[PDB]
Amino acid sequence: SRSSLTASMYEYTLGQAQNLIIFWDIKEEVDPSDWIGLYHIDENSPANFWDSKNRGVTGTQKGQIVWRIEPGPYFMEPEIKICFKYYHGISGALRATTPCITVKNP
C-alpha cells in the first residue's frame, strides 16, 4: 500500500451544507515538517504560494481535516480547480495528492 490523499468529494458548490473532508493515509514514516498544501490547478510557478491545511497535518501518517470551502479571495472564478498536496517535509517531496477538485461558484 502506498501513501494516499483522498477527499470526501472532488466537486464542491459554494453555499451548500455539504462540507469537504480531506483524508490523508500515508505509509511513509512522516516528519513533523510535513504538511498539506492547497494550490490552484494553474499553469504558473510550481511553488504556487496559495492556501494550505494548518495544525493537524504536522507530520501525521493518517487522519482527516474537514473544511468549508467559503467564497473568499482564493475562490473568485465560476469554477475554481484546486488540489490538496501532502508534501513530506524532508526535501519538500510530494508524498500524496488529491484529483483536481471542481469548486463551483453559483
Swiss-Prot record:
Intracellular or extracellular location(s): Cytoplasm; Cytoplasm, Cytoskeleton, Spindle
Domain of life of the organism encoding this protein: Eukaryota
PTM note: Ubiquitinated and degraded during mitotic exit by APC/C-Cdh1.
Tissue specificity remark: Predominantly expressed in adult brain, lung and heart.
Subunit structure: Interacts with TP73. Interacts with FZR1.
Main function: E3 ubiquitin-protein ligase that mediates ubiquitination of TP73. Acts to stabilize TP73 and enhance activation of transcription by TP73. Involved in the regulation of mitotic metaphase/anaphase transition.
Disease: Neurodevelopmental disorder with hypotonia, seizures, and absent language: A neurodevelopmental disorder characterized by severely delayed psychomotor development, absent speech, epilepsy, encephalopathy, hypotonia, dystonia/dyskinesia, and macrocephaly. Brain imaging show cerebral atrophy, enlarged ventricles, and white matter abnormalities.
Protein name according to UniProt: E3 ubiquitin-protein ligase HECW2
Record organism: Homo sapiens
Name of the gene encoding the protein in the UniProt record: HECW2
Shown chain mapped onto the complete sequence: 57 to 162 of 1572
